Every structure is written in structure tokens, then in C-alpha cells.
Amino acid sequence: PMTNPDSGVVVGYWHNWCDGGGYQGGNAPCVTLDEVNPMYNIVNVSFMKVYDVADGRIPTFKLDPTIGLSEEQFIDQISELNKQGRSVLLALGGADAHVELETGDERAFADEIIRLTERYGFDGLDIDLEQAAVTAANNQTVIPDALKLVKDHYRAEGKNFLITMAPEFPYLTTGGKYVPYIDNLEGYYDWINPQFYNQGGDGIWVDGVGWIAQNNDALKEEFIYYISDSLINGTRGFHKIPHDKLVFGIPSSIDAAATGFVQDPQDLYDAFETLTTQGQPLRGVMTWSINWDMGTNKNGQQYNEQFIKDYGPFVHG
Structure with a gap:
């Protein structure tokens, strides 16, 4: 019963908690799965984690009852997303997740x-480790090893368990700390949706063009284009991710991330257009997060699904 997408994706994360505070003082309410705009056709339930170190190192998922869904309602709403052709992944990691898996x-x-x-009908898993967990303990080997077991288990039933990853973009260099997740899952992962945000003054130097920072709003089109062009060709010191397996992750607003929000969506549409014109269209867009897109800012104004309105029709049309 393992639902996969047929073409472009808009990936959105779904908070397993209520009323998160934002980088600019907004609020992110919990929402049910049935409240999620259908243009989010990949929905990542956040997070699989270690809830209590007394229960051992193996991450798990426990639905937060304050969202107002029973177990059965949650399971049913996943089934209903699947009937719409939408996928629901389990996102592993997040802040304070205590994911510190050991060899064995x-x-x-x-x-x-x-x-x-x-139990829940999940269609796959997204590796969304916090900065410090990327190289913690034996995560770089145990997590890929476990996911290969899962993939092949479902392959033997004729099913494609989705495997995706959300590395912070600077760690995708040829010698970067994220390389083992990508190499160890080559041929196993379906796409990578890096976080092109929360890295402040990091960026990319493009010979003949100059220094393009992730927090430079005047060069946002050039940032999206060149960081993508580098990834999808394995150039400028970046590990290759094939263009049909690259999804561009950005914040849903200035409350969802400290930096990296795309002020003018036209910068992304134009960057994607250049990539398409050269024959290397990206697979879609990702955002932290659905609940932020359904949230409020510090003055009580609704974000009013502005992100999915800006990128949903663009990706799916």
C-alpha cells in the first residue's frame, strides 16, 4: 500500500506537536493531516526520535495526543492521503532527538x-538529522545500513519504500560530512531535499560571477541556480545528486527559519527555468514547514498558505 509520486513533488513537513514558536516570534499550530493542502503531495511526519534514553537507542514514533487525533484517526487520515495519491513519510531526527545509533x-x-x-501506513522515511547528529556515534553507517534492509524488505514484496534526505547544503561538498549518507544509499534513495537555509553567510563562489551567499536576497536567483547546477553536475566541489533526484528545500516564511527565505518566488521560478532550459529540471521543492505555512506571525497575521500557493501550482503545472 506504498504510495509513490509520479512526477514533481512539493515536500512539506508536518509537526507532531502544537504551537511552536518562530524565528520572528510567530506561532505554528498543530493541524490534522486532513487539513493539509493537497498540493503538498509528500507529507513528512516529524519526528521519529528517541523520546527517553531509558528506552534504548532505537528511534521510534509516538503520536502527540494534543493534536486531537486518535491512533485510528491518524492511520485513517494517512490512508486517505494515499487514496489521493499523496505520500506520507516518517522524518527521522529533528532537534534534541538523541539519535546516536551504534554499530550493531x-x-x-x-x-x-x-x-x-x-502500523501507520508510512510510504518511506526522510533522514532529517540535526547538525550535531550527522556525525554522532555511528549514525553515518548504521542509518544507511538499516535503510538498505528496509528498502530490500519492501522490494521483495514488490514495493518501493521512499528514502529521502534533508542535509544542510554546505555538508554536500565532495569531502563533506554528509557524503556517507549519499554514497551508502546510492541506488536506494529516491531524492535528496537539502536545506538551502539556516546557514547564514555560507554560500558558493562561482568563478566569473563572485561570492553568492545564502542570505543575500539580491542574488537569490543566482544562488538557487548555481548551488543546484553544482549539485546536479557534481561541479564546484559538490557531490553529484542527479537533477531528477534533487528537490530544493526552502523556508515557508521568515518564522520557519532564521535565514534562507525566498523573498520573491520569481527568483526560484527563473532559476528553475534556467535549469530546465539546460535540460536538467529539478524534481520539485521542499519546505519547513506545513504548520508554519498554516501559522501566524508575531502580530497575529496568518501566513495563509502563501508558500503552497506560491510553489504548488508552479511545481504541479
Whole structure:
């Protein structure tokens, strides 16, 4: 019962908690799955984590009851997303997740991913580790090893369990800390949706063009274009990610991330247009987060689904 997308994707994260505070003092309410705009055709339930270190190192998922959904209602709403052709992934990691897997844990971690997948109807898993967890303990080897077990388990049932990853973009260099997740899952992952945000003054130097920072709003089109062109060709010191497997992750507003919000969507449409014109169209867009897009800013104004209104029709048309 493992729903996959047929073409472009708009990936959105869904908070398993209520009323998060924002980088500019807004508020992100919890919402049900049935409240999510259908143009979010990949919905990432956040987060699979270790809730209590006394329960051991294996991450798990526990639905937050304050969202107002029973277990059965949550399961049913996933089934309903699947009937619409939409996928629901489990996102592993997030802040304060205590994911510190050790060599030897990979079989039990795979078992728990399979168990939650059977119980809830998840269509796959997104690796969304916090900065410090990327190289913690044996995460770089145990997490890919466990996911290969899961992938092949479902492949043997004729099903494609989706595997995606949300690296912070500076770590995608040829010698970067994220490389093992990508190399170890080559041929296993379906796409990568890096975070092109929260890295302040990081960016990329483009010979003949100059220094293009992730927080430079005047060069946003050039940033999106050149960081993507580098990834999809394995150039400018970046690890290759094929263009049909690259999804461009950006904040849904200035409350969702400290930096990286795209002030003018036209900069993204034009960058994607240049990539398409050279024959390397990207697979779609990702955002942190659905709940922020449905949230409020510090003066109580609704974000009013502005992000999915800006990028949904663009990706799906």
C-alpha cells in the first residue's frame, strides 16, 4: 500500500506537536493531516526520535495526543492521503532527538521502521538529522545500513519504500560530512531535499560571477541556480545528486527559519527555468514547514498558505 509520486513533488513537513514558536516570534499550530493542502503531495511526519534514553537507542514514533487525533484517526487520515495519491513519510531526527545509533543497532532499527510502516501506513522515511547528529556515534553507517534492509524488505514484496534526505547544503561538498549518507544509499534513495537555509553567510563562489551567499536576497536567483547546477553536475566541489533526484528545500516564511527565505518566488521560478532550459529540471521543492505555512506571525497575521500557493501550482503545472 506504498504510495509513490509520479512526477514533481512539493515536500512539506508536518509537526507532531502544537504551537511552536518562530524565528520572528510567530506561532505554528498543530493541524490534522486532513487539513493539509493537497498540493503538498509528500507529507513528512516529524519526528521519529528517541523520546527517553531509558528506552534504548532505537528511534521510534509516538503520536502527540494534543493534536486531537486518535491512533485510528491518524492511520485513517494517512490512508486517505494515499487514496489521493499523496505520500506520507516518517522524518527521522529533528532537534534534541538523541539519535546516536551504534554499530550493531542496524537490524533492530530496520525492524522498528518496518513495524511503524506496517502500523501507520508510512510510504518511506526522510533522514532529517540535526547538525550535531550527522556525525554522532555511528549514525553515518548504521542509518544507511538499516535503510538498505528496509528498502530490500519492501522490494521483495514488490514495493518501493521512499528514502529521502534533508542535509544542510554546505555538508554536500565532495569531502563533506554528509557524503556517507549519499554514497551508502546510492541506488536506494529516491531524492535528496537539502536545506538551502539556516546557514547564514555560507554560500558558493562561482568563478566569473563572485561570492553568492545564502542570505543575500539580491542574488537569490543566482544562488538557487548555481548551488543546484553544482549539485546536479557534481561541479564546484559538490557531490553529484542527479537533477531528477534533487528537490530544493526552502523556508515557508521568515518564522520557519532564521535565514534562507525566498523573498520573491520569481527568483526560484527563473532559476528553475534556467535549469530546465539546460535540460536538467529539478524534481520539485521542499519546505519547513506545513504548520508554519498554516501559522501566524508575531502580530497575529496568518501566513495563509502563501508558500503552497506560491510553489504548488508552479511545481504541479
